[PDB]
Amino acid sequence: PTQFEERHLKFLQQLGKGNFGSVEMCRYDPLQDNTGEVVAVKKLQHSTEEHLRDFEREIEILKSLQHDNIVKYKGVCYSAGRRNLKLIMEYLPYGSLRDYLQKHKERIDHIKLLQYTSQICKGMEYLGTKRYIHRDLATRNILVENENRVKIGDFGLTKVLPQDKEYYKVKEPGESPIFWYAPESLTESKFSVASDVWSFGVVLYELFTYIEKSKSPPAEFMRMIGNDKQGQMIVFHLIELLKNNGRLPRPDGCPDEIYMIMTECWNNNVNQRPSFRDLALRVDQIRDNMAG
């Protein structure tokens, strides 16, 4: 059941790319009459030994996850006559939360943003039970299932913690989403549940900006750093800024109690950041206490 035949998998559309993988919208059509289910298919651009090993790990990670706020694993396709590997996931028609919020920003009130926030936290609590570190939380990686439900939608950088170890050092050669990174990820390449909490704070920030371009984390940090800065100078200044309490500003219209949650996530002291369980409870208590 979790093995899809390449001959029945038909390309429809490109969905997106990230890291060293691409995701496409495909019809799985065993009846060969254009009526079959639509699925999302992830492929690697280069099946090097390293990239393929990492992809197999990603597949095992997603397969192991079963939660209402995590995109569903469907299977694998051993394509090119079983000399290639593709990952099959459910396809969510509403797309990413990033694009959804940018489109429906009038429809979506604060209570709804908090509902999405809560759901992201719950998916992350679940990841923590498996000792998985996501390492790439951002609204681009969250999918909308319906107007009332989101799912964490990509796990391309997700790592399993070594047993009883609180962090994983990933000396990555190449680009990184530095404007979502915790300071210790920038300075020591250390990723942990606590660095996911930092990045979650940035996701919460993203939501309350409604993805206004001039308010993005890169736009705001570069404004503080100096828009003229290039290369490593950007990283030097970002690190120095963060170490001495430089932070993203409170978004226009954002309740101060919600900004306080972001600022608590953005603690330089790793062991003082709240847990995802703390965060889900706090966010749901706020929602439950609100005027409506």
Ligand SMILES: C[C@@H](O)c1nc2cnc3[nH]ccc3c2n1[C@H]1CC[C@H](C#N)CC1
């Ligand atoms: C268009 C893009 O936001 C998108 N729409 C999707 C619908 N269903 C999906 N099922 C799995 C991914 C996925 C989808 N993705 C993105 C999510 C992020 C991913 C990465 N990296 C690229 C595809």
